[PDB]
Design a protein around this ligand. Sequence first.
Ligand SMILES: [Ca+2]
Length: 266
Amino acid sequence: NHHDDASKFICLLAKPNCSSLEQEDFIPLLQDVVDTHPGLTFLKDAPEFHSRYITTVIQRIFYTVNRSWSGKITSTEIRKSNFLQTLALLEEEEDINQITDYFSYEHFYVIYCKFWELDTDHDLYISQADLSRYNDQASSSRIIERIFSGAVTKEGRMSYADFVWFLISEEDKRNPTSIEYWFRCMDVDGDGVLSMYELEYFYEEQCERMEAMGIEPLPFHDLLCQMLDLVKPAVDGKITLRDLKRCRMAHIFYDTFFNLEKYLDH
Ligand SMILES: [Ca+2]
């Protein structure tokens, strides 16, 4: 609708005559939430955590709401999300950690500590090498190289904000942002489909791995058959994001190609 809650929300935070919101536009809203909410008022006295919390909540808002990945939230995007409802719930709930969408402090601190552990040089960036060791090398060097390629964002450095997107996507491959996130990493040539040679490229490292452990890996041919039966894409040699969301098993597909540990566990 033209004058709905989403539309009025946009007009409220947007710079004048703008129909969309950028990350910066949410800052005064977050500052207000942190200054007023009883669960968050300790943050006034911990400036590094004050800033990191706001950055993290904003990443989470965009992660879930900004489905076009444009960096600009529209009223349509808000209307299809639970953000305004979550604001309505925020105004009552006194335990910030019960607001598990967007705002949870506990969730933020989990993310912060994980970032802290990976930021080996303590320079506020994560290197490709360090990220490769996250979760005991759970991810392949080829998918990590793709993360650092610009596919989901060269300085060779992942910022705190971008780590938020990585972390959420690595832990939860069932939400649509994550599925797109891994799709963009697997879509090496960026043509919007996963071709069989893009699949082989990732699978051949898992093979180079398996072989190095003394495991004879299942031949590409049979695995690809499995994955096609799994996904049932419209076009076999051109798997789309739509095919992967529709099959409802995208996370299995993804593990099979770049999380060797979670694969063997299947
Ligand atoms: Ca492709």
